[PDB]
Design a protein around this ligand. Structure first.
Ligand SMILES: Cc1nc2ccc(Cl)cc2c(-c2ccccc2)c1C(=O)O
Length: 134
């Protein structure tokens, strides 16, 4: 067992705040924002030894990343940014930093009651995405 086990499971999006605004900060175009913003993704988190995998399934895009904490990796994001990512565990929060073209965004995941809360921050804009177990 590991602390990261509180994250493992299948999670369904149940609420969103400021996603469209967050996407505008990322430079996502109109059509992509509209389609992405309509999606009700599920996220599947699993752990196998030191490897964590985060898989998103949706009607917009399906993505999968696997990584080791603290070890940089290449990621092509759902909106087709090519980024360098590093994911750490900081006091129980999964912290994911994406770097591309001199820009940065941070995605934090935390357990809160029976929910998994994803916070996406770009510049002054915070989006909150709340999931429950599927
Ligand atoms: C973490 C992440 N970051 C994003 C950044 C930008 C855009 Cl456009 C989309 C995402 C998505 C996503 C949202 C809806 C459907 C599918 C994927 C997610 C994700 O939940 O997996």
């Amino acid at each position: 067992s590991h602390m990261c086990d509180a994250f493992v499971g299948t999670w369904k999006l149940v609420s969103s705040e400021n996603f469209d605004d967050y996407m505008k900060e990322l430079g996502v175009g109109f059509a992509t924002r509209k389609v992405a913003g309509m999606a009700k993704p599920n996220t599947i988190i699993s752990v196998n030894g030191d490897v964590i995998t985060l898989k998103t399934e949706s009607t917009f895009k399906n993505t999968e990343i696997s990584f080791i904490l603290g070890q940089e990796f290449d990621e092509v994001t759902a909106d087709d940014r090519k980024v360098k990512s590093t994911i750490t565990l900081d006091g129980g929060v999964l912290v994911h930093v994406q770097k591309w073209d001199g820009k940065s965004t941070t995605l934090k995941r935390k357990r809160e009651d029976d929910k998994l809360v994803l916070e996406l921050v770009m510049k002054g804009v915070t989006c909150t995405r709340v999931y429950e177990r599927a």
